[PDB]
Amino acid sequence: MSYNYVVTAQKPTAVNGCVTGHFTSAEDLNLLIAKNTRLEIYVVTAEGLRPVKEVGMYGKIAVMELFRPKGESKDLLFILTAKYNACILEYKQSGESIDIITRAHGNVQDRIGRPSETGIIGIIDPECRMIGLRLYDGLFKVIPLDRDNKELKAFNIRLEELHVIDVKFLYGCQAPTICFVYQDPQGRHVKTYEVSLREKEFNKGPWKQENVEAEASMVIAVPEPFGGAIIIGQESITYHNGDKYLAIAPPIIKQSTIVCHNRVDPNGSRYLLGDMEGRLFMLLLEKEEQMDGTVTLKDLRVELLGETSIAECLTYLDNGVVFVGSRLGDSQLVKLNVDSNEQGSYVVAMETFTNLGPIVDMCVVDLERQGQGQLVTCSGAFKEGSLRIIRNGIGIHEHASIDLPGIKGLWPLRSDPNRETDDTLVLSFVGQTRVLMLNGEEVEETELMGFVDDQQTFFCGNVAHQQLIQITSASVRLVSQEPKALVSEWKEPQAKNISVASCNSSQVVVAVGRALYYLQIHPQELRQISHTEMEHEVACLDITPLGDSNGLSPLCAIGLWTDISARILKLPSFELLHKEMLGGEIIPRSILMTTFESSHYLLCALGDGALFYFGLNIETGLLSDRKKVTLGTQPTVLRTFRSLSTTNVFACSDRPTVIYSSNHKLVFSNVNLKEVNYMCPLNSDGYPDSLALANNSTLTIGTIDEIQKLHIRTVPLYESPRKICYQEVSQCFGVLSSRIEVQDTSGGTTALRPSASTQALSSSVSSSKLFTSFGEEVEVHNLLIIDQHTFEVLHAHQFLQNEYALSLVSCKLGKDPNTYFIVGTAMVYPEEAEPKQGRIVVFQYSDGKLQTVAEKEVKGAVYSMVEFNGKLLASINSTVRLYEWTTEKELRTECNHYNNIMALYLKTKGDFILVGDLMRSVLLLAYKPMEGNFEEIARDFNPNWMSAVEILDDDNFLGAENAFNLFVCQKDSAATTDEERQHLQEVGLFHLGEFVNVFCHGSLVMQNLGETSTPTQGSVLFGTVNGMIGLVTSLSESWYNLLLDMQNRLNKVIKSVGKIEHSFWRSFHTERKTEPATGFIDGDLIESFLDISRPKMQEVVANLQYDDGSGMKREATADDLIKVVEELTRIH
Amino acid sequence: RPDMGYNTLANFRIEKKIGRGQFSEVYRAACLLDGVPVALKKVQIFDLMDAKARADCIKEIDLLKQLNHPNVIKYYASFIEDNELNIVLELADAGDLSRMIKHFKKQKRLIPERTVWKYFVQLCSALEHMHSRRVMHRDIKPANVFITATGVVKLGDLGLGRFFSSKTTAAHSLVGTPYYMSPERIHENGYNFKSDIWSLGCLLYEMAALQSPFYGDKMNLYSLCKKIEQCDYPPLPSDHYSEELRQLVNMCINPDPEKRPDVTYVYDVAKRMHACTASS
Amino acid sequence: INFDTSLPTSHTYLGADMEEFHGRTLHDDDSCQVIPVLPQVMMILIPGQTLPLQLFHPQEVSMVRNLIQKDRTFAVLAYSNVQEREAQFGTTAEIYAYREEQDFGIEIVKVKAIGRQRFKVLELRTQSDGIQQAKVQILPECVLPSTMSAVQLESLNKCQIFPCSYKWWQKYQKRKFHCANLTSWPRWLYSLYDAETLMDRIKKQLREWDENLKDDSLPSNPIDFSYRVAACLPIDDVLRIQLLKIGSAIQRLRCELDIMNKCTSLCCKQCQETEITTKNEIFSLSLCGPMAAYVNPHGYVHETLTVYKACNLNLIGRPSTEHSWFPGYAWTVAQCKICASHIGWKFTATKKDMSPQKFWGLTRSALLPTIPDTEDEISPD
Ligand SMILES: CCN[C@@H]1CC[C@H]2CC[C@@H]1N2c1ccc2c(c1)C(=O)N([C@H]1CCC(=O)NC1=O)C2=O
């Protein structure tokens, strides 16, 4: 009954693996990346990092590595998913079709097994003959590399050792030896084996076990000539080759455990280390020993290089550049100059990949533009706390604002020979045309002698042959550059008037009355070379030069007032190039030939809001390309300015609709402007690459933003973000933060680094009187208040010592005129397992200060706080409690309800209450104001970890649970017996592939009625620990029946990377049971139906029976799907 | 079966027989769940009383269920099994009041005055308990006044035997001599709350003089009625008992029930008087 | 406390040792089974506990004889209301020790039973002979991976194995639940739903009741430690029912850990106000704990809780050795001061050398846990 639909509004941004090799061919330096399911292969070049390809990975990636077998001229790739789907890739490019085809694929999971505690480790044989994977404890999975085993068929070797921390294949061995450090009650020992395929078992290794550091963590198999293996722990590093043994005790590694390692030399003479905190360590090996030409170690010097972002997977790119992969920070790219030593660091940052994860709490809001959501999220962890202010659009920053009484026409003019910069921007009033001098900040209206003033400007610009054409609706009075005299004035022979003055780079063709003629700007003269009339009046005249030549326009497309059709004909003749069937009633408003990505395009923007997007042929003829994407519902105009070395044509309308093609298909990034009527580029000397926003309110000039899908901002906090809530009236945000402070021998705690809490403009410490060792860390929790414009921290509130803040709510309660910031602390002590004295504290932002105008003392710990229709519903410990905000400003408990579970989540709608604990004990309570007490309706219990929950509607409840899954719940109102009425049915199963932390109601698009409503109902968004912001919106029964019956029809044609089916990928995942996904629709797969090729769209639909409007219409062509699928893509 | 606990025969182990009335039999036994000594009272209602008489007997038994006092025999449970109403009480095997009265009679030594009031106040408290809850005894006598080695007095046989004998009034003359007959009972005027104190006065005189107020050798039931109606009993000695001892029994042993005072008057006298000889 | 706590576990009070069985029987999860039911069993049998029975009815002896050649598994219905024989859940129990004695010319068997699996009954049928056969649907023992498994970085996985225990327990949270900065919930909350931390807090209380060491006696498996605590908990029938339905042992430990916390005072079940004993006065006399199931000479158990000081009891009887459950100990019977129910006995040491001198033996079937102050008894999780 749920009938839902899930789409991705933002792909994952935090990486979980990063390698280097020669993937595309022999002579390439690839930098493969995999964030969560986005395998972003690159190519490293001196210019930087050049993207090549991104693929759709149907699975959660955890193991990735480039290995080159023998007989193969380029690196392959090993791909193993968290669902244990294993496939080995092969890059291939055939001219243009970059296809990452797969050599081998298969599943490598076994029936019974307990996944290990140290996770999953996958390593390959340096001779490229073994795949080493440790999936389950006490069992080693190895697969022989050969052409015969294309299915990755596996054989197993029983391990008599349960704990195995880190296992690595060894360098310099006749047979593949593995070296691993593993914990036993005796201690930590490093033991080896000789895995052999002939006997399908293990064998004795090159040496025995060794007693080593009590916190030995990982191995790093040093390559030849040294061989052996190096083992890094929390305290010291060691070398284990058998007879040889070296170990140094470095005092600067003691700060934190070393997690990430990388080899920056093909012979192992150096190594790159990185800890949890994200600082860089240089491990060097010295071959100073030379017995008789053979070299071995002498010392294991360790150096400190610099501080990077908190690192997960390091990688060395040539010329001392490293991609510092991160998960809870910003992925970086740093040059390791060896002579810098500017302050003690050999690290300077070059690049930064914006990372959305980890998202903890977010609020969909409208910062600037009403009616549209600009999602704000809390992202980062520890020192990398930041806010990801996502917005769906490409706005413009107007650097100028001059009031103009409805500017009806603007065009650049350059009355200055040898300038190469805009000088004049002549306007066009209803019956006048003011010419303005604008070199720097000048906005004065200076009229040239070569130009008239009592006319409506329709074409005022610059042409070659030392002639400046200022064409008005009356006549074309061509002016000069140096003398600025009227060389010629081609007037209408019958004193007629041109409806619009159209012109090219070297020719001007106007539409005088019902006839069209071409008048090129001859050198120091003006003449006409053609004269013809059309059947209907030329409402729109468009004669603009095509590519090349730059002296003539091969084709001109026009609109007929009495026909409302695209009339294309030759410029020096009258033979009709082509006629377009699309169009009627309302005449076209503007026509232009667009050359996006060297591809000819022509969108017919009408005066009623219809843009008949189409192509053109420069040589001869024209196409149809039937596609009309609504660029508004108001009169428009198509004006193109480059400003970026590309076409960049934007059609002004009541809403600003921008026409950009991503690679070869137009992506309508609907711009953010008040109301754009006409557009003209202001490329002045003081306005480089800028533009003039000509509106009906005030003529503005400025620089537009980039052509980006979702422009993401970021503001640094330098402390962990916990929660966020939007408060509209106070014009600010509220965020909970936890800066780690070091317990020194002073009785206080010093801040580690300056942060948002430390550097806030105002700080307050709580003074509540209602109720240690050196070197230890203690969290200090804060409420930070940050403005929505500049995101400056305005107040950092310091809680009591050892006080934990769990819940955030912003609302106005009861019958008061001011809204409140209310946070619930929870005093937790290391001795006390479950806290016993929380708190509820009232804040109200006003006059630049945060004050505690009210306070509440409680016995427990508060976990969730919603506003229940004017009254605050705080769930303390495991007793969901109500309140009533009184007139004395003091919370008073009204009703209580003691739960069989721990009231961790609270979601309310109308007069309902949703309660859940950390183990998926979803509870539904109904308030009865006719009695003043709570009640229970249905109570569903299931043992499984639950991340966050949200109510869809009065009947449907949605949550995110363990094992990267999404589920919905629904209570049937037709329960004939109360036993069924006491149960929450489940109908939603879905493997989201992510781990939600928060749900929020809203959308990032302009909320449009659509007259006939929309397929989707509601709009809820969910964040993630990686940043995969998505959207699930309920659907009708027949909408979901169509989409489901064609999503199954998609997968029979579109192929994935690894031949991983969609059924397997999306199916419900639990450690004990798997079930197909039902009651959900994948929007990312559904949106990918557009990019499929045309002849495949014929195989997709053959018996669909799409139409339901009085007739099945089983044919449903192909555009009927594009009618609905394109409609769907507009929700985000 | 522990599910009903004290409420089944299979839980109990019968040892011997300690009593045998006209209709009911009294046993001492224990239970193989706790072993607590008890008083099992088995009667055959199916052969002695009609259906109507059982409702009043059951309802009265329910009143005795709420009777909880250290000076009264505690009521454990009452149930029906094998067509028998089985009632389990607190067993008092240390003896009854009449045992020492005979013992002092054998010693031919008058019981000290201070000793008489020591336990008579305890019996008055027991009499106060069921009189406050509108329950009568009908069988107040030294026979069912038991004392342990601690000196604590309990009052047992709460008229259960006399409830089944209401249809055999003429049979009272063949089994023993009812020396504690009240004037309202012999005249068939019905039993009232003044009959208990009448027996108490006859009990109090017997505790002092070691004889019944209307005792007589070869004395017949007609002669018993004349003495009871005339209240002709030998006077108590004044040298061994004070005036208050003799005055108290005068009101209790009276032909007119209305003249006889309430239990609170007797109990208050019991508390004040006994405290005097405690320090004497 | 020199009682040699192994004695009550050996059940030397039943006579000669029973015949032991080595085979182990288990039913499949969610399977539909048919199992016999003992008509005269009313104990809420927590699996993982051994329950000794003595049978006197010939049908009971006939029933076990049939089961002796069979799988030796029978159900124990946890009657929420015992009067009408209504049962909604149950427990499948195996038999491993039995002994038949021809006492006084009749065949009497004394049998030890071990409970294995909780199950849901769907139909209650009674055969013509009077023996009850129950439809069985085994509840699956849900196993939960750690709450940090799905939100754990694959790089930090090498720090998740570890080598003044307070400083060590502080160092166990900060290195297993370090990834709490990714999710919305704090470090300390995540531990409250972690098995290896709940059993620590339970062991802390148990050491106040027993002088044993946790390493040997108290098990390490969260499933085992969940059933072990529940059986040896001095609780009534109702509080022990909710601990049988719970499927995941992570919930059961939180519920028991709350049962052991709030229920500081105890009262009789026929008074609901007469305090009898507390939780601090409980001390252990068996390897099973202070609680140890003994049977009365006529097939009738008496789970018993030995406490130092107990009140509101009146002493009845004389010290008789008879069948003293505590070897060397006589007893004096006590009953409730108000409701005249049988609370328990007061044992006295006949030998002055041995310890303890006096300890009260209270049957479990007449004690009611009760929160102090005035509030309803609620057990989260
Ligand atoms: C079988 C005859 N018995 C005797 C005649 C009946 C009555 C009175 C004395 C004794 N008796 C008992 C009744 C019930 C029990 C015991 C004795 C007895 O000892 N127990 C328990 C509790 C004490 C203990 O530690 N071990 C037990 O077995 C009973 O349940």
Task: Domain of residue C342: give its range.
Answer: 275-370
> Tell me, what amino acid is at C267?
C
State whether residue A424 is helix, strand or coil: strand
Measure the CA–CA gap between A605 and A679, rounded to whole angstroms.
14
Closest partner residue to B74 among C317, C340, C365, by Cβ?
Answer: C340
Q: H/E/C letters for each residue in A872-921?
A: EEEEECCEEECCEECCCCCEECCCEEECCCCCCEEEEECCEEEEECCCCE
B36 CA distance to ligand 1 middle (Å)? 9
Task: Domain of residue A641: give its range.
Answer: 393-709
Measure the CA–CA gap between A406 and C289, rounded to whole angstroms.
92
Copy the structure tokens of residue A259.
Answer: 């997690």
A1071 to chain C: which residues are within 8 Å by CB? 143-145
CB atoms within 10 A of CB C143: 14
Copy the structure tokens of residue A192.
Answer: 């080896």
Count of all residues that appear for chain A in the document: 1132
Residue C185 annotated as binding? Answer: no
Q: Which residue ranges have their beta carbon within 6 Å of ligand 1? A: B 13, 30, 32-35; C 296-297, 320, 322-326, 331, 345, 361
C108 CA distance to ligand 1 middle (Å)? 19
Query: Do residues A33 and A42 lie in contact, with contact meaning Cβ atoms separated by under 8 Å?
Result: yes
Query: Do residues C90 and C118 lie in contact, with contact meaning Cβ atoms separated by under 8 Å?
Result: yes
Domain match, A1012 and A1040 both: no
The answer to whether B271 faces chain C, any CB pair under 8 Å, is no
Domain match, A635 and A504 both: yes
Domain match, A896 and A783 both: yes
Measure the CA–CA gap between C46 and C76, rounded to whole angstroms.
9
User: Method used for this model?
Assistant: cryo-EM
Domain match, A209 and A83 both: yes
State whether residue A1009 is helix, strand or coil: coil
Is position C28 within any domain?
yes
Copy the structure tokens of residue A284.
Answer: 């060097």
Query: Do residues A41 and A33 lie in contact, with contact meaning Cβ atoms separated by under 8 Å?
Result: yes
Q: Where are the beta strands (DSSP E) in A828-871?
A: 837-846, 849-857, 862-867
* Number of domain units in chain A: 4
Query: Do residues A478 and A521 lie in contact, with contact meaning Cβ atoms separated by under 8 Å?
Result: yes
Closest CA to A952 of A1033, A1036, A1040: A1033
Would strands A1030-1034 and A6-8 be described as parallel, antiparallel, or unpaired? antiparallel
Element (H, E) at A190: strand A187-194
CB atoms within 10 A of CB A664: 9
Closest CA to A63 of C154, C179, C151, C158: C154
Domain match, A656 and A745 both: no
Measure the CA–CA gap between C125 and C131, rounded to whole angstroms.
9
Measure the CA–CA gap between C34 and C70, rounded to whole angstroms.
13
Has domain B97-278 been given CATH number 1.10.510.10? yes
Measure the CA–CA gap between A799 and A782, rounded to whole angstroms.
6
Q: C124 vs chain A: nearest CA distance in angstroms? A: 20
Closest CA to A751 of A786, A715, A798, A785: A798
In the listed set C138, C159, C183, which residue is the last one of a domain according to the structure?
Answer: C138
Closest partner residue to C316 among B36, B68, B75, by Cβ?
Answer: B36
Copy the structure tokens of residue A230.
Answer: 């190096």
Measure the CA–CA gap between A357 and A380, rounded to whole angstroms.
6
Give me the residues of B, 52-111, that contact C with CB < 8 A: 68, 74-76
Q: Taking CB atoms and an 8 Å cut-off, how many pairs form between chains A and C?
A: 130
State whether residue A311 is helix, strand or coil: strand
Torsion (CA) A1082, A1085, A1089, A1092 in degrees, nearest 10: -170
CB atoms within 10 A of CB B52: 8
DSSP 8-state assignment for residue A684: B
Starting at the edge strand that comes first in sequence, how are the strands of the sheet with A921-926 ordered?
A: A905-909, A912-916, A921-926, A939-941
Measure the CA–CA gap between B210 and B224, rounded to whole angstroms.
18
Measure the CA–CA gap between A177 and A193, rounded to whole angstroms.
6
Copy the structure tokens of residue A937.
Answer: 């309706």
State whether residue A642 is helix, strand or coil: coil
Domain match, A48 and A128 both: yes
Query: Do residues C362 and C307 lie in contact, with contact meaning Cβ atoms separated by under 8 Å?
Result: yes
Q: Please, what's the b/e burial string for C273-296 (b: 16 or more CB within 10 A of its CB; e: otherwise)?
A: ebebbbbebbbbbbbbbbbbbbbb
Domain match, A614 and A748 both: no
Resolution (A): 3.4
Closest CA to A505 of A535, A544, A454, A450: A544
Measure the CA–CA gap between A108 and B256, rounded to whole angstroms.
106
Count of all residues that appear for chain B in the document: 280
- Atom of ligand 1 at shortest distance to CA of C326? 25
Measure the CA–CA gap between C305 and C347, rounded to whole angstroms.
12
DSSP 8-state assignment for residue C364: G
Q: What are phi and psi of B98, to 5 degrees?
A: -70, -15
Burial of B143 (0-12, 13-18, 19+ CB in 10 A): middle
CB atoms within 10 A of CB A979: 8
In DSSP terms, which residues pair with A527 in a beta bridge? A520
What is the distance of C-alpha A624 from the center of its chain? 35
CATH number of C44's domain: 2.30.130.40
> Which residue stretches of A193-327 are H helix?
none
Copy the structure tokens of residue A1103.
Answer: 């018996």
Torsion (CA) A789, A794, A796, A797 in degrees, nearest 10: -110
CB atoms within 10 A of CB A1017: 14
Is position C49 within any domain?
yes
Domain match, A200 and A242 both: yes
Q: Do A898 and C376 touch (CB under 8 A)?
A: yes
Question: Residue C24: CB partners within 8 Å, gap ≥ 6?
Answer: C94
Could you tell me the CA-to-CA distances from A364 to A388, A730, A1005 in Å, in that order?
12, 17, 11
Q: Would you list which residues of B are annotated within the binding site for ATP?
A: 18-26, 41
Q: What are phi and psi of A1046, to 5 degrees?
A: -110, -25
DSSP 8-state assignment for residue C28: P
The answer to whether C296 faces chain B, any CB pair under 8 Å, is yes
Q: What are phi and psi of A429, to 5 degrees?
A: -80, -170
CB atoms within 10 A of CB A65: 18
Q: C22 vs chain B: nearest CA distance in angstroms? A: 33
CATH number of C295's domain: 2.170.150.20
Give me the residues of A, 245-304, that contact C with CB < 8 A: 257, 259-260, 276
Could you tell me the CA-to-CA distances from B115 to B110, B111, B143, B153, B270 in Å, in that order?
11, 7, 18, 13, 12
Query: Do residues C9 and C292 lie in contact, with contact meaning Cβ atoms separated by under 8 Å?
Result: yes
Question: Residue C50: CB partners within 8 Å, gap ≥ 6?
Answer: C96, C112, C113, C114, C293
Measure the CA–CA gap between A516 and A518, rounded to whole angstroms.
7
C1 CA distance to ligand 1 middle (Å)? 24
Could you tell me the CA-to-CA distances from C139 to A114, C30, C90, C120 in Å, in that order?
21, 6, 10, 7
DSSP 8-state assignment for residue B236: P
Residue of C nearest to B74 (CA): C340
Closest partner residue to A166 among C144, C158, C166, by Cβ?
Answer: C158
Indicate if B62 belongs to the active site. Answer: no
- Atom of ligand 1 at shortest distance to CA of C13? 28
Question: Residue A790: CB partners within 8 Å, gap ≥ 6?
Answer: none
Q: What are phi and psi of A155, to 5 degrees?
A: -125, 150
Query: Do residues C67 and B28 lie in contact, with contact meaning Cβ atoms separated by under 8 Å?
Result: no
Measure the CA–CA gap between A774 and A752, rounded to whole angstroms.
14
Tally of CA atoms within 13 A in the half-sphere of A158 that contains its CB: 1
**Sign of the four-CA dihedral A1092, A1098, A1100, A1105:** positive
Q: What are phi and psi of B250, to 5 degrees?
A: -65, -45
Q: B176 vs chain C: nearest CA distance in angstroms? A: 33
From C7, C294, C322, C332, mutation site for ligand 1 pocket: most ligand atoms within 8 A of C-beta: C322
Class of domain B12-90 (CATH, top level): alpha beta
Residue of C nearest to B13 (CA): C298
Greatest CA span in chain C, whole angstroms? Answer: 74
| CA angle, A904 then A909 then A911, to 5° | 100
Closest CA to A653 of A668, A669, A673: A673
Helices (H) and strands (E) in chain B, counts: 9, 7
Domain boundaries, chain B: 12-90, 97-278
B34, B47, B56, B139: the active-site residue: B139
In the listed set A999, A1034, A1069, which residue is the last one of a domain according to the structure?
Answer: A1034
Q: C110 vs chain A: nearest CA distance in angstroms? A: 39
Query: Do residues A390 and A709 lie in contact, with contact meaning Cβ atoms separated by under 8 Å?
Result: no
Closest partner residue to C378 among A62, A898, A995, by Cβ?
Answer: A898
Measure the CA–CA gap between A785 and A847, rounded to whole angstroms.
13
Closest CA to C286 of C340, C318, C327: C327
Burial of A974 (0-12, 13-18, 19+ CB in 10 A): exposed
> Tell me, what amino acid is at C62?
S
- Atom of ligand 1 at shortest distance to CA of B29? 6
CB atoms within 10 A of CB A71: 7
| CA angle, A12 then A13 then A16, to 5° | 90
* Number of domain units in chain C: 2
Residue C339 annotated as binding? Answer: yes
Copy the structure tokens of residue A477.
Answer: 């009075």
Would strands A763-765 and A793-798 be described as parallel, antiparallel, or unpaired? parallel
**Sign of the four-CA dihedral A874, A879, A880, A882:** negative
Measure the CA–CA gap between A71 and A543, rounded to whole angstroms.
59
CATH number of A771's domain: 2.130.10.10
Copy the structure tokens of residue B125.
Answer: 């408290």
Element (H, E) at C233: none
Peptide bond just before A225 cis, omega within 30 deg: yes
Task: Please tell me which chains touch A, using 3 or more CB pairs under 8 Å as the contact test.
Answer: C
The answer to whether C183 faces chain A, any CB pair under 8 Å, is yes
The answer to whether C242 faces chain B, any CB pair under 8 Å, is no
C119 CA distance to ligand 1 middle (Å)? 36
